[PDB]
Write an enzyme that holds these catalytic residues in place. Sequence first.
Site, short mmCIF file in Angstrom:
data_model
loop_
_atom_site.label_atom_id
_atom_site.label_comp_id
_atom_site.label_asym_id
_atom_site.label_seq_id
_atom_site.Cartn_x
_atom_site.Cartn_y
_atom_site.Cartn_z
N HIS A 91 0.69 -1.18 0.01
CA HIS A 91 0.00 0.05 -0.10
C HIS A 91 0.77 1.33 -0.08
O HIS A 91 0.04 2.38 -0.01
CB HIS A 91 -0.96 -0.14 1.10
CG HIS A 91 -1.87 -1.18 1.11
ND1 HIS A 91 -3.09 -1.07 0.14
CD2 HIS A 91 -2.06 -2.33 1.77
CE1 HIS A 91 -3.53 -2.17 0.10
NE2 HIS A 91 -2.93 -2.99 1.07
N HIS A 145 -3.07 -3.59 8.03
CA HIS A 145 -4.05 -3.97 6.92
C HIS A 145 -4.78 -2.41 6.51
O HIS A 145 -5.17 -1.84 7.50
CB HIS A 145 -5.27 -4.68 7.33
CG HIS A 145 -6.32 -5.29 6.56
ND1 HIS A 145 -6.17 -5.54 5.20
CD2 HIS A 145 -7.86 -5.09 6.73
CE1 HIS A 145 -7.33 -5.93 4.58
NE2 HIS A 145 -8.03 -5.63 5.29
N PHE A 146 -5.12 -2.29 5.29
CA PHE A 146 -5.85 -1.34 4.77
C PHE A 146 -7.20 -1.63 4.86
O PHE A 146 -7.87 -2.42 3.89
CB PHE A 146 -5.52 -0.80 3.33
CG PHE A 146 -5.84 0.50 2.86
CD1 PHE A 146 -5.15 1.64 3.44
CD2 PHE A 146 -7.06 0.78 2.08
CE1 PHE A 146 -5.63 3.07 2.56
CE2 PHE A 146 -7.62 1.80 1.78
CZ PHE A 146 -6.62 2.98 2.07
N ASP A 147 -8.08 -1.11 5.72
CA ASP A 147 -9.53 -1.40 5.78
C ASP A 147 -10.31 -0.56 4.63
O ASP A 147 -11.01 -1.27 3.83
CB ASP A 147 -10.06 -1.04 7.22
CG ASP A 147 -9.53 -1.84 8.18
OD1 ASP A 147 -8.12 -1.76 8.15
OD2 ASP A 147 -10.15 -2.39 8.90
N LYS A 180 -4.53 -9.63 -8.37
CA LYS A 180 -5.30 -8.95 -7.20
C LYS A 180 -6.41 -7.94 -7.58
O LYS A 180 -6.04 -7.21 -8.54
CB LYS A 180 -4.52 -8.42 -6.16
CG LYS A 180 -5.21 -7.94 -4.96
CD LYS A 180 -4.40 -6.98 -4.23
CE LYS A 180 -3.45 -7.68 -3.15
NZ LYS A 180 -2.98 -6.21 -2.27
N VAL A 230 -8.69 -5.83 -6.06
CA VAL A 230 -8.68 -4.47 -5.72
C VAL A 230 -7.55 -4.11 -4.62
O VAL A 230 -6.92 -4.87 -3.97
CB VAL A 230 -9.88 -4.13 -5.01
CG1 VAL A 230 -10.13 -2.86 -4.39
CG2 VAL A 230 -11.31 -4.52 -5.90
N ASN A 231 -6.80 -2.94 -5.00
CA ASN A 231 -5.75 -2.51 -4.14
C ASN A 231 -5.49 -0.93 -4.19
O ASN A 231 -5.66 -0.48 -5.13
CB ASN A 231 -4.54 -3.05 -4.54
CG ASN A 231 -3.40 -3.24 -3.49
OD1 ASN A 231 -3.50 -4.06 -2.53
ND2 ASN A 231 -2.38 -2.11 -3.53
#
Length: 123
Positions: free
Chosen positions: A11, A118-120, A40, A42-43
């Site tokens: 991220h 973690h990216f929420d 992947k 979505v990011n």
Amino acid sequence: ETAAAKFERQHMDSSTSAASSSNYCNQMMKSRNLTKDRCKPVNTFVHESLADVQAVCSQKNVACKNGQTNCYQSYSTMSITDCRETGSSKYPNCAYKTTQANKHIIVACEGNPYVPVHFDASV
Ligand SMILES: *CC(=O)NCCNc1cccc2c(S(=O)(=O)O)cccc12
């Protein structure tokens, strides 16, 4: 890979203030190894210094989408880039749509030092 390192790799992009062009996601998803065995879907990339993202762990405490309570919402807006696979994308030819925006970020924090793992989401 440690939890903090995986977060950083997936991220953090403090080298740019914001996505340049529409090919930004295609290049970044590839170079950060997010298209290695699967596309992947979505990011989100954050364009702020590591210290400013890390600082979020001391900001507003909120619930995580999963209901856990170790999530924090940034007080201010931050430069982010949303990367989402196109309806037509298929491995190994991963294709992404790039969307630049300034939003508040929400991250889950853990350990000691207490850092983002973690990216929420963003709002
Ligand atoms: C993009 C990213 O944040 N990568 C870090 C690794 N993925 C990850 C870490 C921690 C939790 C978590 C969750 S969970 O719902 O809190 O269990 C879900 C998906 C990915 C992660």
